[PDB]
Amino acid sequence: SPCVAISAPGCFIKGSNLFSEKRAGNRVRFFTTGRDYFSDLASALDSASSSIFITGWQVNYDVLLDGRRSLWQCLRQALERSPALKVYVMPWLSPSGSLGTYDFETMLAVFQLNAGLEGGARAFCTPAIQQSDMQGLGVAFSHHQKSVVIDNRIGYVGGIDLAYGRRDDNDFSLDASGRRGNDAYNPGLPHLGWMAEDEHVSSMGLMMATLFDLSSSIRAIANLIADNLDIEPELERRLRAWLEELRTAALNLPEALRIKSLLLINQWMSETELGQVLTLIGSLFWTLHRLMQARAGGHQQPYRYLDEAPQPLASPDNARLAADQPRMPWQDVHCRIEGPSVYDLARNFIDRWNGQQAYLAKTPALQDTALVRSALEAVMKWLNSLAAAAGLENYLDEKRNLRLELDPPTPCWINAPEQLPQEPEVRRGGMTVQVLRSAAARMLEQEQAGRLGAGVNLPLQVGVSTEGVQSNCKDAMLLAISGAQQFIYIENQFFQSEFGKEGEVFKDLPLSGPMASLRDVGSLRRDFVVRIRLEEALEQRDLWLLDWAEVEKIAQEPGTEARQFLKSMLAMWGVNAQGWLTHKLGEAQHGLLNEIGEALARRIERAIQREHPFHVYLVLPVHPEGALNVPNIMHQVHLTQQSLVFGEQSLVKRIQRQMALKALEGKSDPAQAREIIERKDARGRPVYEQQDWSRYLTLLNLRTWAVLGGRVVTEQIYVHSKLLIADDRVAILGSANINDRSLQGERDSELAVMVRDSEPLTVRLDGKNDAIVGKAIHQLRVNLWKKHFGLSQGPGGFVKPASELSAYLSIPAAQEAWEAIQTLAKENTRAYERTFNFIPQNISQTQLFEDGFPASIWPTWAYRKPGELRAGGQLMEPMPYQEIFWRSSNLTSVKTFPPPNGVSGFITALPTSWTRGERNDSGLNLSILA
């Protein structure tokens, strides 16, 4: 019975900003591997006969779905099979190609789906502009939903984008050598191998096959700005004199020349509309979009390297992981839904699509159209010059006499009855599903305008809202947390949640040693810094104010220190400058806003008060995907550790204070009790820190290791899931991270489902007392635990199965279960740390403080002076984000590592002391990181 019935109060969310109401009668299939979701999707695309809707934060056309065909090939085969079928692809329109989503390339690939299709175009791609309420900071926000709907009858939703690196299985293999192109995925490592140019498609190759029917960089960028220059009259004159100076420069440019080049180039890419399009590679973009869509659609056949000879997309520099370099394994959860709630998934896609169409199709003012037209001629001047240089001049000549292409961005509505879903009849039984959104007030307004423009008003349930911010994902998590009776299991990419005041940062250390090395001018060599007047140029936020005469003399100064200084100085400038920009774009919040951490602690506090058992499992990534020496990554780690342990009102401290206060219950009245528990102990720590919070909370990371190319290697298993289970009775699955960006509702858009199974299963969650739970929810958690314990892998692993834990799979609320899980995780971590000093961990192994010195954000870092921590420091041994970790240099040789001994399962302990004392503040606007 517990929450089984559809009238049961407190089981699904209600209130004033619902995207949907719960519906019974669904069939849900859960995917616990990306391989299984992609394989299931390929099969469903092979059945599609009417419509295919795809939206995602990242959509990569060349990703293999079924081991043989790309997403693109599966879409093309469906269009050829079903003459009435239409395809719509809505990837997030990222503001920079540097985010690695490749939406621009996928867009061109989608255009090619129409090449040679009998009849008109039936494949459409509209990349989706963020519709947040964050005003000037909107550029930092995204559409983060991951959803696919086929024939308005099969709906997919969860955390898995159709993207590089997402496909993976129960082996979490580190070998990347069989992955194709960018699907060999590890953003934290330098990529020291080569993608052969004749086996990979370049973006330019793809553009060239879009425009025509084919069936150092400083001097390079300079000669490009030259041809399109003949712009604010001041920048023109600097660019006038700049070009003349290059024409007489030496093969090796003077340093002052080489830096004012990158200042002038950076001004061009950011200020003029032409360079603004290349950084995306304005309504210039949409006019280009229409032109390219129309050209590709007239071609006789799709580009050969999409279909006849499918090759992966290359990376921008054709670098890839070398044979000895590990991929980063991908942990994620997704599902497939059939039944009434597919209607709500279809409604999300259709209303979003039509809202984007209404937005982009608005007519500009004549003076704006005149600027877009002018920039388009140049953009088409640039693209046509590359084509000439690529030996495609004959294709250029054949188009000389055609009509000037400038058709207006026109709305492509989804409004034919065949593409629209039918309002479902009420059902009973099966799975009850409620579709949840995070969506900004601005988003809902554009959706209303798309309903008006397309003439589409899909019937809504009563009490569904079409106005105001939707924060359904946060509200459903809060409901599940407060309603939980025995335990909660959470997998999430993030734990960033309101934690009170920042805590534990060492006095006399305004910035951590590592962060100061990236941000703080006082960490550079002072004699070079004072000579070029760097400090003062930073104070006035203008790099032109350096003493360029001293810049060139240091540039010639022989040895190591002088060549290095200018490099680090310029990198520091960029970090500082990004900090200044993000604070100018919009107001910064103070601290984190979402209350997930408080709500988990509040539920544990109730257990403490009642003297009842309760437990929360949190499974999180070791650290955000990417390299640990990137400031925004370092800052997210900082906020994670504050949210979990170091903040004054962190999850662990909220729990410990409540345990301490209960120990004093009756003995003392309040107010005084709150002061007695703060009294500092022998080592200077508040006495409530003696409370064993591990009775209530287990924190886990995932890790594996292998011998790759004759070398011992390790990598985090990236927990990308966004999954919450309570009591094996409800699952919340979707795209919403535990951070402000996902949960507040007015920032990134998100999509999720709350699922309950009406099919009962009798279990003993705590090992003793019978409980009726949801059969498929229970099975989902059991499958995830089998996977993380190493019980689902095939033969030939380096990590053994943790078969000692199979006894606990069905009793997650038993104290014996979490105690066994904690013990094995701690033992795995000890085995890893015996050989790897560079992984996140509690105690520094290189600094050589009763337990020792806490390990730094860069674990091989040591501070020069324990007394004056602001004296700086250095990496004592390489970090994996460095090339010398992987490849010998003239003075260093590649260090090796003994294999870990005794690791069973992939679970490891989250290091609750990692970075204690360090303020890893990137200087970026906290609202962008929150």
Author numbering: 24 to 238, 328 to 342, 346 to 396, 417 to 983, 993 to 1074
Paper text:
Close examination indicates that the reactive His167–His855 pair resides in the loop connecting β4–β5 of the HKD1 domain and β17–β18 of the HKD2 domain, spatially in the vicinity of catalytic Lys169 and Lys857, respectively. The conformation of the active site region is almost identical to that in eukaryotic PLDs rather than prokaryotic PLDs, indicating a eukaryotic-like catalytically active PLD conformation of PldA. In PldA, the main chain carbonyl oxygen of Ile1072 forms a hydrogen bond to the side chain of Arg876 from the α24 helix, which is adjacent to the conserved HKD domain. In PldAFL, the α11 helix stacks against the α4 and α9 helices, and these two helices clamp the α3 helix connected to the lid region, thus stabilizing its conformation. In PldAFL, the lid region forms a short 310 helix (residues 120–122), packing with the β2-α2 loop and the α8 helix. In such case, the lid region is positioned distant from the entrance of the active-site pocket, which becomes accessible to the solvent so that the substrate can gain access. Our structures of PldAFL and the existing hPLD structures show that they adopt an “open” conformation, with the potential lid region draping away from the active site and allowing the accessibility of the active site to the solvent and the substrate.
As a cognate immunity protein, PA3488 can inhibit the activity of PldA to avoid self-toxicity. PldA is mainly composed of 27 α-helices, 25 β-strands, twelve 310 helices, and many loops, folding into three regions: the core catalytic domain (CCD, aa 24–935), the peripheral helical domain (PD, aa 215–441 + aa 647–721), and a small C-terminal domain (CTD, aa 936–1094). Compared to the open conformation exhibited by PldAFL (pre-open state), PldAtruncate presents a highly open conformation (open state) and the PA3488-inhibited PldA reveals an almost closed conformation (pre-closed state).
